[PDB]
Amino acid sequence: GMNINPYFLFIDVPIQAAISTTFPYTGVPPYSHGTGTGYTIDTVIRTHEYSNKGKQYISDVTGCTMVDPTNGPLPEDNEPSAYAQLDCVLEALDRMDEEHPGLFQAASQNAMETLMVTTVDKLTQGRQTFDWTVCRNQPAATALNTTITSFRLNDLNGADKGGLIPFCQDIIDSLDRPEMTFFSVKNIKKKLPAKNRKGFLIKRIPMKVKDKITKVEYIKRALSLNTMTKDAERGKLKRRAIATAGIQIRGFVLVVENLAKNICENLEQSGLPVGGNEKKAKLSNAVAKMLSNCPPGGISMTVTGDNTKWNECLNPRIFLAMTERITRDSPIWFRDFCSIAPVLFSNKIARLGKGFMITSKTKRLKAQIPCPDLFSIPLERYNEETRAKLKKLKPFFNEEGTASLSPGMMMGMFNMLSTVLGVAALGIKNIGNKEYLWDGLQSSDDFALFVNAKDEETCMEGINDFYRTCKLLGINMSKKKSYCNETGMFEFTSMFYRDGFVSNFAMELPSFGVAGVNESADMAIGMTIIKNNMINNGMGPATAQTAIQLFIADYRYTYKCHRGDSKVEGKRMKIIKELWENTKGRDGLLVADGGPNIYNLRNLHIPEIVLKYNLMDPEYKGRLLHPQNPFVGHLSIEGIKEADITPVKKMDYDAVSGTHSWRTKRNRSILNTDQRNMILEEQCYAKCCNLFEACFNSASYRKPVGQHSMLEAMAHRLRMDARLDYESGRMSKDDFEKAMAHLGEI
Amino acid sequence: GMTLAKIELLKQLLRDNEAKTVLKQTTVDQYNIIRKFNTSRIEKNPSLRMKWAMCSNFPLALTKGDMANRIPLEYKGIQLKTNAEDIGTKGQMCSIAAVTWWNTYGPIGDTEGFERVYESFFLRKMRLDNATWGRITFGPVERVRKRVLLNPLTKEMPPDEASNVIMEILFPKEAGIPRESTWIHRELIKEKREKLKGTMITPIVLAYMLERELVARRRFLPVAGATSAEFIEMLHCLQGENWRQIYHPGGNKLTESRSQSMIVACRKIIRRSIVASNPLELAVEIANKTVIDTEPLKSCLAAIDGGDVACDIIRAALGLKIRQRQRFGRLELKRISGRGFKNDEEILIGNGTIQKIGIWDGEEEFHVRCGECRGILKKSKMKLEKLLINSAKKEDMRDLIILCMVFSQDTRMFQGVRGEINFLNRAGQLLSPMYQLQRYFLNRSNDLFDQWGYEESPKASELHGINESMNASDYTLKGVVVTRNVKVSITKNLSLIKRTGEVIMGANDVSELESQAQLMITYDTPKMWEMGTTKELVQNTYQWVLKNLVTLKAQFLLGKEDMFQWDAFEAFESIIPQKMAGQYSGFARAVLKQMRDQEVMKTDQFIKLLPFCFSPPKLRSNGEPYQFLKLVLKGGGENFIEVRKGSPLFSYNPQTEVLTICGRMMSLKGKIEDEERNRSMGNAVLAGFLVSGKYDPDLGDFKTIEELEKLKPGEKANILLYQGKPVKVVK
Amino acid sequence: AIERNLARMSPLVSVTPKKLTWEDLRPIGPHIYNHELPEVPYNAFLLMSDELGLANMTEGKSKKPKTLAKECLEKYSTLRDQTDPILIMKSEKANENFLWKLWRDCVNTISNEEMSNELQKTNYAKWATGDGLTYQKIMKEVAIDDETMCQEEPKIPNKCRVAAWVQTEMNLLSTLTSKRALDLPEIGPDVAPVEHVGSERRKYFVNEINYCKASTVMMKYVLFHTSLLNESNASMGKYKVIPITNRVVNEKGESFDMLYGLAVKGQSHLRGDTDVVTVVTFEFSSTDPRVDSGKWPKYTVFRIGSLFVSGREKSVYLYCRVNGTNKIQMKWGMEARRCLLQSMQQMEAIVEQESSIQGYDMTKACFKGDRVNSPKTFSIGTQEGKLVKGSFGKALRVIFTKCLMHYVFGNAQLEGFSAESRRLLLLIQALKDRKGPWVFDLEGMYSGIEECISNNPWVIQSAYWFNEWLGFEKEGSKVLESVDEI
RNA sequence: AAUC
RNA sequence: UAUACCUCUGCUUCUGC
RNA sequence: AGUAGUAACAAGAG
Incomplete structure (x- = not known):
């Protein structure tokens, strides 16, 4: 017979040209199941395995087990070394300061002048953050508000000033407070009268109770990082652990990252923060220079590179020494400000996920052993894999149920500053005045070294000299994953260069599906992702015209909104069929209302509502675009324009706000749980903020400013609103005297 | 009036103690923190959660209001909503059927104003409906990555200025402190407040739609030919990596946008026509049938009172007057007398950096202009000599002095550039040095006036002087005065000569910056590719060589130098830097004739070098030609051919017998000689050099071009062809 | 340094x-x-090459998923009313009786005059869906004490x-x-x-x-996973029978409503995305499972009649299997x-x-x-x-x-x-x-x-x-x- | 004949 | 114990830069 | 059973 082989295309088309066919992105990504305690503990063991030959000591502040590899003995093996030598890091920075002069002090100024303008609300955009008060990963907006209210009880009102700088001053001072009080809500049963046979009813009214902890317990909570597992991460067999840090450290990371970002913008050998078509250019132009720069009658080789254990090897004490040298000219307060975030990460404590579920198959029973009770049970009970891990965790394990992770960078967070240390490695170029020359590109763990030299045997000796340099910085190159060749083609952050960066349609492919915002927004997003890929991801008009069909297909099933004439049965479809038979201008109907798809290559940039507006019936457009309709309700400046796409970058779109721009129900699981108390706590704020917006209509658009009281602002606003309306004639003597009587009471 | 209800609702709110404490404890800053407080976690998999939630009964939440109550609980058996309240919205949860029921049988609202509210979008439809399309054309296209405006704005402003304008339109009482911007856009505010008067739509929506039609959306995209926002929005349908589409948007087009295009159209006509003989006759041929969007270059140059050196040369070449004007952004000049010449020098600036600037030499006389204010400028190399300006507004007088100071390239101006603001883009591409010096000194002018110096004012009847504050003064700026009083022919080689004999414009004077045009730069005649870029021309030539290889390979073994020059190669030469064109053509003609005269032929090497043989050859003093590793082309370090290896623009796979030309695969199978199977490439790598054997270690290391050129005819040597293939070659 | x-x-x-x-x-x-x-055994969710569609030529317009599967079986009644279990292949941990009784319970439920597609929670359906097979949550203090309870080695x-x-x-x-x-x-x-x-x-x-063939399988997979997710949210507690449907059009231009089998979705109270809902498949096929025995160790196959492919006869089989999906995998189907x-x-x-x-x-x-x-x-x-x-x-x-x-x-x-x-x-x-x-x-x-x-x-x-x-x-x-x- |  | 062949719940103890 | 694959689900809670 005849055996068809898909790899036989690679005879006709080279690997880089048809790279799209090596990415299985129509398939399902790998997800985690159950706990991530063993995954975390494995990271904790590995992190301490790379530093164990350094200086081990006991922290007198926390009472934890700390390890220090910096300025330690150099490795005599190819295993991941965390033993980075300070002097070499400082010399690498000094060279970078020479090659890029006046940058450090300018960027240190830029970040400092930013800091002054930066408000406290800046902390609200940190997704899920660890709330130290309740020990749960909560929304950043809430986790902040819990921390501001708790501080107020301990005489810390820095947030009231409006600037970030006093709130950060309160965080460093909150360590010094001996007993940190905070709120915890508890329910009281109360009789409320009713027509209930026995004329009353019990209602569990919540009430807030003051709760204390010790200085050390608060220090440890402030130094806590809550650990999960990494779901939906592509191109990997086994899963890995991630982490989320607390509200305290969040403030200090922003500035240190902003500082490094300012440096990374100006550095010529970095792909950060630059992205999209900017980074596509920056690398393309920087390749041409570093290509034609090489000696004629010589060799230029491109090492397609990648690091290993990137997070686990880089010590926080190096990052501390980095800031000091960058802020050298900047004032003593800012030097101390920048030094905190690396001091925290240096003494961080890692929480150990959920725990370990133990079972008996005969009895058919299950039970989670929580993190503190890991050693309240003989180690023979755990499986062989977990038994080795728990034995190795012993010296680092804290009796409360955490592990002190002094070395490494759990999660990472410091992307830019760690990228700068990479660029600093690339900035050396030569060792001992030999006949090679290197320069490359950098994005955290991913690098792309070039080497220009006389012959290829020299080049490899230069890459060894590069490897042996990066060991001294704590940057471990992956001998397995990395590979070298003659310059012309390479890979970098899944961007494939072959005498030009090739198109890789499979990377964006998942984003062609239905988004999950709403019928009006998803349509606009869908036609936008098509339009965009045609341009810069290399989708031809046929495939683009197919994608228009394939979006509408998924849209019509997802939102259950097939063509009014089509006889596909459904709850909504029953009313959709009536709409079709009622309306005359049926081509004016939106697909969401079982209308016909009018979209094509040319009009992808226009919103469906705007296109069809001329062909709608007055009654249809009147209902569709009704001003006081209940479906949309209340909008926000971020909500109308922008929406997430997968760090998660928030792209923007254009669509008319009408009946199809609706919202969904809240997750009602909260009703069964003890966190019911937050539901009223929300609606209390919502009542205040919605009233504030009735007084100040610009509060929706513009962020209001004022250190004074929120009531005070509302009172003064309503005072003039009354007085002027009387004098103008909009208010009567009857109503004015009522209004002046009420404001007197307040 | 609502006032009473607000206060009486504040009375309701202040009765609850928990609400009262919030209002007293929360600051006006903190509003933004407490507004974002909720139980709602962020949805990680929205595509999933939406697909799931749509299969449930009542997934939509509703707003607690009278209109929500006007939706019935069920309709024809289908449950539209449920009495169960939502946590966040405090409203009756509902099904997606409710949305359709509202749209089919609901209340019919007020649609008056909508079109004016969402104006910005309707003009995109207006720009598609009124528009017209042209021809699709398949063929290679270089697409360059450059920051561009995504959507065309009503009036461009900074983020703060647009916001302050918005505030004045919608929320006048809460606007706060007025700025200058309050006054500047007073007509726009008055217009927008009159336009957005009758609408019922929410303020937060209205402010979003203004922000789109005021604040600029600028991001990087791949572009080629069209840079204007009204094209950028249609980009996806204009050009792909292997095709071109002609498009003409509707409404109206800007006058400045038509010039920026018009310059590059001329600049390329001249840049092409120089290498081909009778440069006027080719330039006229093209210029008669070039098109900018819709208007021909003839009509554009006639209507527009602008352009540069290139525009004037073509204006002459076609016929009619030539406006010798130079627009330095805000400044607009006209030449009285003198003739400058550009020169690139390393100039140290005030902050402590040295950047290359094209300095203008020789003494000259210009007639300056800046809005309302007028004047006459005189300068020499790096020195402003005179500035006889008229009296006008402070801002028009101040900025005209700053424009003239930078223009002059004065040594006093360069010493006051203190405050690190350099010209090198984030994406590794240099900005224009002179224009970036304008933007620096327009805002930060205190250094300029301080570092310039002052002197005595003029004591004539009509002449007076002004100080730093722009008022009549005794201590005036060193070389500034405020007074009260306010045919040609063309050569074969494209130089404009006066009736006397002096040359006013030269072909050598046009700027070599082959930048991106604004509008559709069409050529109505065939062979349009001839006005393209390096990779467009390089490819299209080699495509034409392989197209006629059957004829060109035969006619190269019969007629000696008949087919060395061809209509296609003229264009190919124009992207060779003409300082080397002859030197490459000496090498090319010599190595190709070595394969003709002797038996050692190579078709891949033939096709590679055949385009280089148009230019009349230029040999050494010996007689032998110039030897090369790579043949470097115009612009970009990656742009070159390689003799002894495969290059980014030209490489050959002899296993498959397939040639890669700027990415595109081209089959040379069934078009090759059988004796090339094991034939060495050293016999077409150096001119007048052939292979004896393989690398002989007694001959030493691999000898360089300079060493090889300086060897006696009949001396053996070691040549490395492509990495790992040594060859032993004799002269 | x-x-x-x-x-x-x-x-x-x-x-x-x-x-x-x-x-x-x-x-x-x-x-x-x-x-x-x-x-390596065949472990796809549905069949691909081996499938057999029961072609009912229709008006072309859509109808209820019960009604099409009913009329599909009405046309091919010989197979519908084949009550006698002629067993061919067995999966090691299967229940021949329960599986066949399930198929008969499906066929009759699709065949009946009632509106609902719900299947009764029988003794067999509770085995085939895995009713009550989840383990019991207990207090940590009890599990710590209970010496038999241990962390199992990973699969x-x-x-x-x-x-x-x-x-x-x-x-x-x-x-x-x-x-x-x-x-x-x-x-x-x-x-x-x-x-x-x-x-x-x-x-x-x-x-x-x-x-091509791959296009039909792809469309079958999608349309099954579209309805399978829809039943899973709406009918959580109810055991429901879902057909394996696809509308196909030939070179003449005539709509043949197909049927490649019937399936039964278990109880779907799906909290997390990765939570499983066990689905039992019953799929028609011309392929004899005894040809490639090592292909079908996961499947249990009966023989249920015959069909003339053109002139010469092909014996029809019923590939049965206990399978499962989850919210993520169902979405990726759509x-x-x-x-x-x-x-x-x-x-x-x-x-x-x-x-x-x-x-x-x-x-x-x-x-x-x-x-x-x-x-x-x-x-x-x-x-x-x-x-x-x-x-x-x-x-x-x-x-x-x-x-x-x-x-x-x-x-x-x-x-x-x-x-x-x-x-x-x-x-x-x-x-x-x-x-x-x-x-x-x-x-x-x-x-x-x-x-x-x-x-x-x-x-x-x-x-x-x-x-x-x-x-x-x-x-x-x-x-x-x-x-x-x- | 570029900036933002 | 019982109410509870009832009632509530389907990302809301983990999902970051 | 099965799904799955280094640990879970095969309903949970009052």
Whole structure:
């Protein structure tokens, strides 16, 4: 017979040209199941395995087990070394300061002048953050508000000033407070009268109770990082652990990252923060220079590179020494400000996920052993894999149920500053005045070294000299994953260069599906992702015209909104069929209302509502675009324009706000749980903020400013609103005297 | 009036103690923190959660209001909503059927104003409906990555200025402190407040739609030919990596946008026509049938009172007057007398950096202009000599002095550039040095006036002087005065000569910056590719060589130098830097004739070098030609051919017998000689050099071009062809 | 200071580089050729090549999923009313009686006059869905005390050898039919000239795939996963019977409502995304399970009648299996039509690139071959250790099949394999381009690739297909390009 | 004839 | 114990830069 | 059973 082989295309088309066919992105990504305690503990063991030959000591502040590899003995093996030598890091920075002069002090100024303008609300955009008060990963907006209210009880009102700088001053001072009080809500049963046979009813009214902890317990909570597992991460067999840090450290990371970002913008050998078509250019132009720069009658080789254990090897004490040298000219307060975030990460404590579920198959029973009770049970009970891990965790394990992770960078967070240390490695170029020359590109763990030299045997000796340099910085190159060749083609952050960066349609492919915002927004997003890929991801008009069909297909099933004439049965479809038979201008109907798809290559940039507006019936457009309709309700400046796409970058779109721009129900699981108390706590704020917006209509658009009281602002606003309306004639003597009587009471 | 209800609702709110404490404890800053407080976690998999939630009964939440109550609980058996309240919205949860029921049988609202509210979008439809399309054309296209405006704005402003304008339109009482911007856009505010008067739509929506039609959306995209926002929005349908589409948007087009295009159209006509003989006759041929969007270059140059050196040369070449004007952004000049010449020098600036600037030499006389204010400028190399300006507004007088100071390239101006603001883009591409010096000194002018110096004012009847504050003064700026009083022919080689004999414009004077045009730069005649870029021309030539290889390979073994020059190669030469064109053509003609005269032929090497043989050859003093590793082309370090290896623009796979030309695969199978199977490439790598054997270690290391050129005819040597293939070659 | 440390550092620390050569590239996956291991079993959610659709010709317009499956069985009643269980194959841990009783319970429930598609929670259905099989939550203090309760060792995927059914699945799914499955809706009219090129390109590109087997399987998978998610949220507590439906249109243009089987969804109180809802499949087939026994150890097969395929008779079977899906995998079913784009873009790139070279629309040329240019041809596969040249249309579909197989066998083994095998693919492309490739730790690079090959069929077959292709690209390049300029 |  | 063949719940103890 | 694959689900809670 005849055996068809898909790899036989690679005879006709080279690997880089048809790279799209090596990415299985129509398939399902790998997800985690159950706990991530063993995954975390494995990271904790590995992190301490790379530093164990350094200086081990006991922290007198926390009472934890700390390890220090910096300025330690150099490795005599190819295993991941965390033993980075300070002097070499400082010399690498000094060279970078020479090659890029006046940058450090300018960027240190830029970040400092930013800091002054930066408000406290800046902390609200940190997704899920660890709330130290309740020990749960909560929304950043809430986790902040819990921390501001708790501080107020301990005489810390820095947030009231409006600037970030006093709130950060309160965080460093909150360590010094001996007993940190905070709120915890508890329910009281109360009789409320009713027509209930026995004329009353019990209602569990919540009430807030003051709760204390010790200085050390608060220090440890402030130094806590809550650990999960990494779901939906592509191109990997086994899963890995991630982490989320607390509200305290969040403030200090922003500035240190902003500082490094300012440096990374100006550095010529970095792909950060630059992205999209900017980074596509920056690398393309920087390749041409570093290509034609090489000696004629010589060799230029491109090492397609990648690091290993990137997070686990880089010590926080190096990052501390980095800031000091960058802020050298900047004032003593800012030097101390920048030094905190690396001091925290240096003494961080890692929480150990959920725990370990133990079972008996005969009895058919299950039970989670929580993190503190890991050693309240003989180690023979755990499986062989977990038994080795728990034995190795012993010296680092804290009796409360955490592990002190002094070395490494759990999660990472410091992307830019760690990228700068990479660029600093690339900035050396030569060792001992030999006949090679290197320069490359950098994005955290991913690098792309070039080497220009006389012959290829020299080049490899230069890459060894590069490897042996990066060991001294704590940057471990992956001998397995990395590979070298003659310059012309390479890979970098899944961007494939072959005498030009090739198109890789499979990377964006998942984003062609239905988004999950709403019928009006998803349509606009869908036609936008098509339009965009045609341009810069290399989708031809046929495939683009197919994608228009394939979006509408998924849209019509997802939102259950097939063509009014089509006889596909459904709850909504029953009313959709009536709409079709009622309306005359049926081509004016939106697909969401079982209308016909009018979209094509040319009009992808226009919103469906705007296109069809001329062909709608007055009654249809009147209902569709009704001003006081209940479906949309209340909008926000971020909500109308922008929406997430997968760090998660928030792209923007254009669509008319009408009946199809609706919202969904809240997750009602909260009703069964003890966190019911937050539901009223929300609606209390919502009542205040919605009233504030009735007084100040610009509060929706513009962020209001004022250190004074929120009531005070509302009172003064309503005072003039009354007085002027009387004098103008909009208010009567009857109503004015009522209004002046009420404001007197307040 | 609502006032009473607000206060009486504040009375309701202040009765609850928990609400009262919030209002007293929360600051006006903190509003933004407490507004974002909720139980709602962020949805990680929205595509999933939406697909799931749509299969449930009542997934939509509703707003607690009278209109929500006007939706019935069920309709024809289908449950539209449920009495169960939502946590966040405090409203009756509902099904997606409710949305359709509202749209089919609901209340019919007020649609008056909508079109004016969402104006910005309707003009995109207006720009598609009124528009017209042209021809699709398949063929290679270089697409360059450059920051561009995504959507065309009503009036461009900074983020703060647009916001302050918005505030004045919608929320006048809460606007706060007025700025200058309050006054500047007073007509726009008055217009927008009159336009957005009758609408019922929410303020937060209205402010979003203004922000789109005021604040600029600028991001990087791949572009080629069209840079204007009204094209950028249609980009996806204009050009792909292997095709071109002609498009003409509707409404109206800007006058400045038509010039920026018009310059590059001329600049390329001249840049092409120089290498081909009778440069006027080719330039006229093209210029008669070039098109900018819709208007021909003839009509554009006639209507527009602008352009540069290139525009004037073509204006002459076609016929009619030539406006010798130079627009330095805000400044607009006209030449009285003198003739400058550009020169690139390393100039140290005030902050402590040295950047290359094209300095203008020789003494000259210009007639300056800046809005309302007028004047006459005189300068020499790096020195402003005179500035006889008229009296006008402070801002028009101040900025005209700053424009003239930078223009002059004065040594006093360069010493006051203190405050690190350099010209090198984030994406590794240099900005224009002179224009970036304008933007620096327009805002930060205190250094300029301080570092310039002052002197005595003029004591004539009509002449007076002004100080730093722009008022009549005794201590005036060193070389500034405020007074009260306010045919040609063309050569074969494209130089404009006066009736006397002096040359006013030269072909050598046009700027070599082959930048991106604004509008559709069409050529109505065939062979349009001839006005393209390096990779467009390089490819299209080699495509034409392989197209006629059957004829060109035969006619190269019969007629000696008949087919060395061809209509296609003229264009190919124009992207060779003409300082080397002859030197490459000496090498090319010599190595190709070595394969003709002797038996050692190579078709891949033939096709590679055949385009280089148009230019009349230029040999050494010996007689032998110039030897090369790579043949470097115009612009970009990656742009070159390689003799002894495969290059980014030209490489050959002899296993498959397939040639890669700027990415595109081209089959040379069934078009090759059988004796090339094991034939060495050293016999077409150096001119007048052939292979004896393989690398002989007694001959030493691999000898360089300079060493090889300086060897006696009949001396053996070691040549490395492509990495790992040594060859032993004799002269 | 860097040089000071670089001097005193141990020589043992180094990249230890070696130049890559064709002989250093050993074949990936030794175990997959070892005959001691079992062959990789068929473990797709539904059937693909082996399926059999019961064709009921209809008006064309849609109807209730019960009503179509009813009238599909009404036409083929001989199989519907076949009550006698003629058992052929059994899955080791199956219940012949319960499974058959379930099928009969389905058939009758679809056959009945009632509106509901609910199945009663019987003694068999509770085994087949796995009722009450979840373990009991207890207090931590009790589990700490209870000495029998222990953390169980983890389940690891077993090591399977190469199986021919994957090759044959590829071979069959790639091939053409006279039937079109896709439901591709309307779009706006073509005004611009690019839209006319895009339209005339689709007439060749889309209708090449639409007329193949892989297109029908893809559409079947989607339409099942669309309804299966819909039942799972609405009818949580109810055990429900869902048919395996697809509307197909032939060359004449007549709508045949198909039926490739019936299935039953378990109880679906799905909290997390990865929570399983067990689904029991019953699928029609012409394939005799005794042909390839090692293909069907997961399946339990009865014989339920016969059908004349044209003239000679084919015996009809019923492939039964307890299976399961989850919220993520169901969603990805609904977004499986995007398999078209990933393969269509790739080959539209060739049409676009070839259109630049010749300067006109090279669509019609690539497929059919116009006056000027011959048709574009591709190396499609092998014929007894030799090459074969397939046409454009075939080469388009072979890529489209792989994109569907990336879904159908999409998991942690495929993702981790595809990524690490790429590194080796790029190293081969350097040796193909003669760009002198060097490697620092090849064994450890291989180690990353080889550990991902366990029991995923498409991973195991692609390990073989890699080693076949490697063998051809090894003998081509190492002979011709080794001696040329010498 | 570029900036933002 | 019982109410509870009832009632509530389907990302809301983990999902970051 | 099965799904799955380094640990879970095969309903949970009052």
